[PDB]
């Protein structure tokens, strides 16, 4: 028993991180097969970032202007191209440690593990969620750009995030591995507004089911409610509205605990209107929304990977 | 910027986990050089665990009674021995993926990463602290026994914990890699009492310094205090007393923020007597004690590993 904010094992990804250097800028890249992916602003100086013309900047660079260093070995750049906001550097050596991988564009509310890297070396790993406003609340210092987020399904690595920038508000923004930003952000150093950050209601509910499985049941009241009356209360507290798809995803958890989804919603409503009153749930005095329904079943059943 | 409960990259450890089977019981083992370490109760049945005579049970077992499986390959057991509460199985093949490693017995309040494994396959990784009562609050299901905790220093892996059992209270207990339990526990299925769990005060202080570095400064009052007057208040709330060694360890953080240790203590005292009043610090409504002073500097400077 017990419940922890758990990350995926990072072994398969550690063998794919490289150091990419262009001119003076150095950041991290992802080496899969014979191509290296990295943020395109590796070609910018501190002054270029205020208003960069990436096309014009990329024309001035040749294949030999890029230094790719795998741990302590240099890959030869024989081809470069720009796909949206990432650079694809084609090198001469295919990564012998390339795992089975896919590129995926996740949706808000989904979770993934981040391997924070500096100078192409892994520093730590943590689990987080894509917020409804397409930001993440991560931990990144200068030089962490190019760090990637990922999920693991059995033996396959699903890359879903590449880190690009910290906004003036302290939150973080990035792209999928095709270089398309999550959210309305651009790789430029300017004031950019993130929308209202809402709470991922389906994840809160999944967490409450985890609490029941692990012995915390004080929050279970004997009331019930309807989807409409619940969403009316949720919206007042900046909670994402609940749909039937969400109710369907929670089905396995409802069956294992004998607690109907709508009954759990009635419990959550009471917590929103009345608060926790100095109590905790799974050791927390706030409602957690960084566990999906799939995360809860994985941790409460013991799923493994290769 | 930002602050996350961060674990070490687990790559170096993933290549060391094996499946150990004796009779019907199967759990995880740690394969370093030509020896495999695992909990000795792998030789017990469900009925043996109530009152096991490990010496007498081990006599009935021969080298060929143990099945060691590395992923999908079998190591031949050519020697077995019992060191305290662990079994040392000497095999015929040295692990080609053996990293530089040490065995270390950590002290309460120190943190480490756990790689939770089932059937010798990694499931996830999380960071936790050894409580002052020598328990950990982990996430473990049946078959997770033999999972290890570890730290990383540059390129060397320090193994500090092997998981052995869940107490009837839901908390977890285990040994160092020499088989000596942390705490007064024994590998027997009986009611065992853990002492009072106290809050690791030096870690709370380090966390408060992390908050200041990251922009949360509302809790900074303009009072001060003495070590004696502070410890008098701490003890009333089940907080570990502060010593001069603790003040010395916090020195680098005091210098970087310009806030004297004793001034921070005065701020913490106020939080203990008055509470948070519905506010948060680094996104938390409780005081966190699972970050050491060393963890804070590592995450606020960008330390890396190989
Ligand atoms: Zn950058
Ligand atoms: Zn066991």
UniProtKB/Swiss-Prot annotation, chains A, B:
Role of this protein: Cleaves the C-terminus of replicase polyprotein at 11 sites. Recognizes substrates containing the core sequence [ILMVF]-Q-|-[SGACN]. Cleaves and inactivates human TRMT1, preventing tRNA guanine(26)-dimethylation of tRNAs. May cleave human NLRP1 in lung epithelial cells, thereby activating the NLRP1 inflammasome pathway. May cleave human GSDMD, triggering alternative GSDME-mediated epithelial cell death upon activation of the NLRP1 inflammasome, which may enhance the release interleukins 1B, 6, 16 and 18. Also able to bind an ADP-ribose-1''-phosphate (ADRP).
Q: Where is the Peptidase C30 domain?
A: 1-306
**Which loops or segments lie on the Cytoplasmic side of the membrane, by the record?**
1-306
> What is the protein name stated in its UniProt record?
3C-like proteinase nsp5
Q: Where in the cell is it found?
A: Host cytoplasm; Host Golgi apparatus; Host nucleus
Q: Where is this cross-link: Glycyl lysine isopeptide (Lys-Gly) (interchain with G-Cter in ubiquitin)?
A: 5, 90
* Activity regulation behaviour: Inhibited by pyridone-containing alpha-ketoamides compounds 13a and 13b. In turn, alpha-ketoamide 13b (tert-butyl (1-((S)-1-(((S)-4-(benzylamino)-3,4-dioxo-1-((S)-2-oxopyrrolidin-3-yl)butan-2-yl)amino)-3-cyclopropyl-1-oxopropan-2-yl)-2-oxo-1,2-dihydropyridin-3-yl)carbamate) inhibits SARS-CoV-2 replication in human lung cells. Inhibited ex vivo by michael acceptor inhibitor N3. Inhibited ex vivo by compound 11a and 11b.
The highest taxon in the source lineage is Viruses
Q: Which residues form the active site?
A: 41, 145
Its quaternary structure?
Answer: 3CL-PRO exists as monomer and homodimer. Only the homodimer shows catalytic activity. Interacts with host FBXO22; this interaction promotes the proteasomal degradation of nsp5.
């Amino acid at each position: 028993s017990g419940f922890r904010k758990m990350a995926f094992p990072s072994g398969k990804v550690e063998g794919c991180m490289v150091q990419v250097t262009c001119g003076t800028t150095t950041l991290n890249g992802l080496w899969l097969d014979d191509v290296v992916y990295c943020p395109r602003h590796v070609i910018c100086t501190s002054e270029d970032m205020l208003n960069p013309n990436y096309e014009d900047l990329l024309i001035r660079k040749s294949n030999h202007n890029f230094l790719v260093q795998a741990g302590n070995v240099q890959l030869r750049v024989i081809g470069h191209s720009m796909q949206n906001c990432v650079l694809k550097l084609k090198v001469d050596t295919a990564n012998p440690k390339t795992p089975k991988y896919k590129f995926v564009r996740i949706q808000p509310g989904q979770t993934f593990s981040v391997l924070a890297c500096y100078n192409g070396s892994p520093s730590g790993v943590y689990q987080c969620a894509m917020r409804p406003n397409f930001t993440i609340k991560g931990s990144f210092l200068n030089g962490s750009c190019g760090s990637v987020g990922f999920n693991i399904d059995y033996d396959c690595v699903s890359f879903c995030y590449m880190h690009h920038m910290e906004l003036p508000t302290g939150v973080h923004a990035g792209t999928d591995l095709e270089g398309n930003f999550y959210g309305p952000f651009v790789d430029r150093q300017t004031a950019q507004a993130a929308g209202t950050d809402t709470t991922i209601t389906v994840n809160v509910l999944a967490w409450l089911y985890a609490a029941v499985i692990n012995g915390d049941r004080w929050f279970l009241n004997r009331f019930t409610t309807t989807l409409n009356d619940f969403n009316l209360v949720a919206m007042k507290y900046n909670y994402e509205p609940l749909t039937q798809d969400h109710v369907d995803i929670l089905g396995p958890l409802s069956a294992q605990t004998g607690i109907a989804v709508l009954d759990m919603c009635a419990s959550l409503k009471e917590l929103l209107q009345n608060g926790m009153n100095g109590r905790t749930i799974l050791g927390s005095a706030l409602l957690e929304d960084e566990f999906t329904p799939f995360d809860v079943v994985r941790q409460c059943s013991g799923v493994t990977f290769q």
